[model samples]
Target: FSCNVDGGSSIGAGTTSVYVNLDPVIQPGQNLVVDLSQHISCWNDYGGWYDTDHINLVQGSAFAGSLQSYKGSLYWNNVTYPFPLTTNTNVLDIGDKTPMPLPLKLYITPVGAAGGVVIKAGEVIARIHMYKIATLGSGNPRNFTWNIISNNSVVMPTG
Candidate 1:
């Protein structure tokens, strides 16, 4: 792991990084889905939960969503919830886990809506960033690999 958050000032000003690569250019109208099962559920944090709360997902330069809002969703408990996934601060938990569902899946659809088709050509590269989040625990390390499993046109790396 690049860094860990167990408390203190690390939770306010912290950053984590992971690399990804694309084999082919991602054309417009194509959707990309990165399964959260690969990179989640390994945190050795308190409360037996993934300690990713209120973090920013920084996009790589190759990402073509500089103009439009990035549409993303987390699939868990047989329901899908849309979220504004991007380089901004976001709260994954509502102070507790009773209301929020477990995020088992992570998907991206470029239209800024739920399951919307892509409308512009762009690339989802490696080197995703996580900023300002508290990571707890010591039993399971927060680590996972990301792979492009939707279409056979691109290649992605595991985290």
Candidate 2:
């Protein structure tokens, strides 16, 4: 399986940024949606794992809501299967596995399929929603930056 951001191999190398308008009175916040995509060929199941520790925020800004993950789908042979046959869990780990904040893990497999699934390149596999508060708090407003380091894998069952 392969993944890319804006046709680029890495998200950091891609052109993407978060702009926040910090106003104490206004409290204008912004919602960020990250779409994760992948490419798989002849794979019965796909497993993706990710972790982030740099969800840094300005003094006045903080995460305002919960993290949300939208379900995805997979195409196998000529049929489609609701992705993530299972569910999200933290039992799996990759990279340093340093649970600075937490890890995002997903597993998907096609049921009643005679062959493996073939996914198109850059097919969206998951969507994540994050809300950031852009209001000035008690502390002085400052600039902050964050990054995402992820590790993914794919599996095929054996007869």
Candidate 3:
């Protein structure tokens, strides 16, 4: 009746394998069963860090509670920054470009409606904002997430 299995086989020998599947369909109102992968994140190079294990998020469904997650511009380069490269907060400018790597693993899904039946979901792991400082920070409103990667977007343009 309950399961949350995460990567096994001891993860000993240069391991990278994860599998999660929970298909329990009922989905009835006011909260039947939440965390259908709430803010579900993927991508892992875990402790060693970088390349492939990229989990980038921040789009929607933080239960629509909203605090802020999606904004933009996350990066990484040449590895090494485990600290102490003159360490100015590990330094990241991303100016000349080409240095995009981060601790990513975020899936966002939230939008709602009850009674009449309207259920969206959960997931919101976002952080990043630079584009002219989020367009000069208008009332500090920075809402992002619409990058379906290349194909572009699908939602999030709530007037």
Candidate 4:
């Protein structure tokens, strides 16, 4: 499976929704895992100019406040996993619209290779957590925006 970001519709001026797309599907019980190491190549290819496997929250007009915390979850096959977001300073402050690094490399695996799970292509792999600040009335519709910086690496089956 591979990961990509989709620009979803806006629900409100202060609310921005984005979707993470994972293409192709794995069987219900098949063991599959994502190799985040591939991101290093992409990162190097860019000469470390941009971040890989991260999401940048771009604050737009009518910004109310910064993001204090975010909430979301991830799934591997049939098992649910925690999606942790951390910044360079070990804080959850996205008030400045900084890029948040995802725990993309650590969420996979099931002990040994025999315990992996399969995910289908084009499936929504995870939920995007965003901050809902004060509402802006009748101004710029897009108060916030985001983009995914990924390596688009293919997942490999372990075992």
Candidate 5:
């Protein structure tokens, strides 16, 4: 394993990164826990799809692994893990018991919303990947209702 990265002050010129100390040995035939709440940065106000300092999953894949996405289309650029799948590859490979801390990435597009252009956004919901074994229910699609947006304002009315 590589050396862990240290944390630092963020208000200053540097910030810290806390890595996930995932387990090192998951039993065979075990299910992995993850989430589908990717990243989303919406504009302060609402208009429905464009023109704001916003960011939401426009398109991406809902694969058993890291899914890719784009904006303005129904096409979700999906992806799978242990990508370059090997004979020993499975959800476990990218899991705790699996020594492989598979590399994953989620992308988002920041759009602009009209509100006198008030930009209000943050980590509304945390993004985490999930894993299953059914070869079908692997991607656990759960809804995270307590996002920052939900906590900040009550109305979704446009400005």
Candidate 6:
């Protein structure tokens, strides 16, 4: 079992974004467990202002296996993104139209015929795309912290 975690801050204006990608190609088909979280804050004294802002979890064309069951949360201002308790689906897209504040968390578990998410040999899965939008501020650099993990193992995404 392994776990991965990442945290940091960045300075930017107008609109910006970051990414967290993972290709856990499993062999012999084994169930996978994963988690992701992020926090973002900007210098918008006026507050409540945003447009075309969101996060996209593309299954990517290279992935061969389907997403089993997962849950997540994304909320800022009056907008929100939520995932069902369990779903037989793929791809996650969460968008917010208001600035407010951003805090997101996601968890996934793979199962197979035995009521589990079984992975096939060379099964490809996991990817994340974070979107950001902040108006010019008084040096309030939009600060953010993000991380992804699997089976207690730290899995850091590539930007």
TM-score of model number 3 = 0.18
Candidate with more favorable, higher TM-score: 3 or 6: 6
Q: lDDT tens digits, residues 1-159, model 4? A: 012123222133232223233333333233234332222111111223222222222222111111112222233223344443332112121122222223333233222223232333333233233322222243122232222222232233544
- Give the candidate number with the greatest lDDT: 1
* Model 3 misplaced stretches (Cα beyond 4 Å): 1-61, 64-92, 107-143, 146-159
Best by TM-score: 1
Clashes of 5: 21
Q: What would the TM-scores of all predictions be?
A: 0.34, 0.24, 0.18, 0.26, 0.23, 0.30
Residues 25-130 of candidate 3: C-alpha lDDT, one tens digit per residue: 2232211212213221222322223222212222221221231322222222323221101221222222212223332222322234212212222322222211
Stretch of 10 with least lDDT, candidate 4: 61-70
**Candidate closer to the true structure by TM-score (higher is better), 1 or 4:** 1
Clashing pairs in 3: 39-123, 55-104, 55-105, 61-109, 61-110, 72-128, 76-101, 108-123
True-vs-predicted CA distance for residue 132, candidate 3, Å:
5.2
What number of backbone clashes does candidate 4 have, counting pairs of residues 3 or more apart or in separate chains? Answer: 8
Candidate 6 Cα misplacement greater than 4 A, ranges: 1-5, 8-35, 38-102, 109-125, 137-159
- Residue-level lDDT of model 2, residues 8-123, one tens digit each, is 33221112332211111111121122222222111101223222112211122112111113233433223333433332211211223211221222223222221322122223
User: In candidate 6, how many Å is residue 73 off?
Assistant: 7.2
* lDDT for each residue of candidate 1 in 7-117, tens digit (9 for 90 to 100): 111212223332222224344455566554443322212333456444333333123343236555645435555543333323343233322322445555444332323
Which of candidates 1 and 4 is the stronger one according to lDDT? Answer: 1
Instruction: Name the weakest run of 10 consecutive residues (lDDT summed) in model 2.
Output: 19-28
Q: Could you give candidate 6's per-residue lDDT for residues 29-60 as a string of tens digits?
A: 33232323433433233334332233222222
For each of the candidates, give the backbone clash count.
11, 0, 8, 8, 21, 16
Q: Candidate 5 residues 27-131, lDDT tens each?
A: 322222222123211111223322222111211222211122211111112443331122221222112211222233322221232222111222122222222
* Root-mean-square deviation (CA) per prediction: 11.0, 18.9, 16.4, 13.5, 20.4, 11.7
